[PDB]
Amino acid sequence: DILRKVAEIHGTPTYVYFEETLRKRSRLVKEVFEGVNLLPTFAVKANNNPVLLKILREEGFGMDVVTKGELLAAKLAGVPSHTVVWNGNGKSRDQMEHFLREDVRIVNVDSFEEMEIWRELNPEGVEYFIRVNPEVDAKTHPHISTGLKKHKFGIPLEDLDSFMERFRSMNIRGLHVHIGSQITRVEPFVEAFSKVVRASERYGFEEINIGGGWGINYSGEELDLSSYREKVVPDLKRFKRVIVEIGRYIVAPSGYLLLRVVLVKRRHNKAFVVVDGGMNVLIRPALYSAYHRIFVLGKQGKEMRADVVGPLCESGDVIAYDRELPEVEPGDIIAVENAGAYGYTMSNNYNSTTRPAEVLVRENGRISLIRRRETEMDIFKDVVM
Ligand SMILES: Cc1ncc(COP(=O)(O)O)c(C=O)c1O
């Protein structure tokens, strides 16, 4: 009833997060690294609601931030600035001075050009990690490999020497590697990390930031944590500090997306269950094509086959394609699972729609609104007439 409870009180579309899941998954990540001197951080890009970030701070997580905006979410969540790690490929001098005024002291440098700007400021107390892109076996994980050869981030790991030649003597404490997202195989991590750890040992670095990217079960895949703890963690044990930057694995399962069915449109062979939010609420299915399982609150069955689509005047405004479902009726509620990451953070106002509400079901059972629903006036809040 709990999910319907929330829809009755707060309406739809509404993301609903469970504190219990957020704490258990964050504790699960820490436990994988038992034996390691870990500084766990949460990737704010996956979910920036400060109420959820406060829960993660209580669980011992710092924050991986990219923008001023992310840094403010951390501040709103009462995160101590010495547990913030700053990532980014477009750090401007203005941004650096701002981050320095906030006492951020851990920076994952993306390029030679960024490092030259840091020297012109020459801040004291800042620890730098150099983002590197290890070569990953092209014929096996072809998708992680070309991203780490063609994407705009970091420097090739083969060019680390060229970077250290120019910048030696700055407070460079280690390397940062982040190889991708939604990874459920352990081998890519073992391959990339063994190279980065080897490189770290040549320079004698005592810290390392191994990024994030752990995948979740969207349609049946699962990252084997036993295998990961057996194959990856031992290499990490030497370091005085290991930082990880986890987003999706922690927050995605904590969230559902609730949508009310407006009508069920039949067209011969096919059926379109039209709900009250689409790509303006959850963009993943139309931008990434990711698969989220769905279900109907209070109903089970397989008598209908349908696409679940949004109300927007756009062709790929689809939440779910070809799913078996019970006989859906207008007014039913569809719940989309694994909606807690890259969900609200990618919501928008396309077709002059309003952004969804967010609610938190606390461990004590209290249902708390943590993100009100945009009004129609909110859509035009910044128009200057
Ligand atoms: C540098 C960095 N670290 C960690 C993460 C995210 O990983 P995920 O949410 O897959 O854990 C991101 C995501 O963009 C990132 O860019």
Describe the protein in words.
29% of the residues lie in helices and 25% in strands. With 385 residues, it is of the alpha/beta class. The protein folds into 2 domains: 1-18 and 248-372, Beta Barrel (Lyase, Ornithine Decarboxylase, Chain A, domain 1), CATH 2.40.37; 19-247, Alanine racemase (TIM Barrel). Strands 1, 11, 12, 13, 14, 15, 16, 17 and 18 form a 9-stranded mixed β-sheet that branches. Strands 2, 3, 4, 5, 6, 7, 8, 9 and 10 form a 9-stranded parallel β-sheet that branches. Strand 6, helix 7 and strand 7 (155-156) form a beta-alpha-beta unit. The termini are far apart. The structure holds pyridoxal-5'-phosphate. Pyridoxal-5'-phosphate binds next to strand 10 and helix 11. Pyridoxal-5'-phosphate is lined by residues 43, 45-46, 64, 87, 178, 181, 211-214, 245-249. It is an enzyme of class 4 (lyase). Pathway: Amino-acid biosynthesis; L-lysine biosynthesis via DAP pathway; L-lysine from DL-2,6-diaminopimelate: step 1/1.
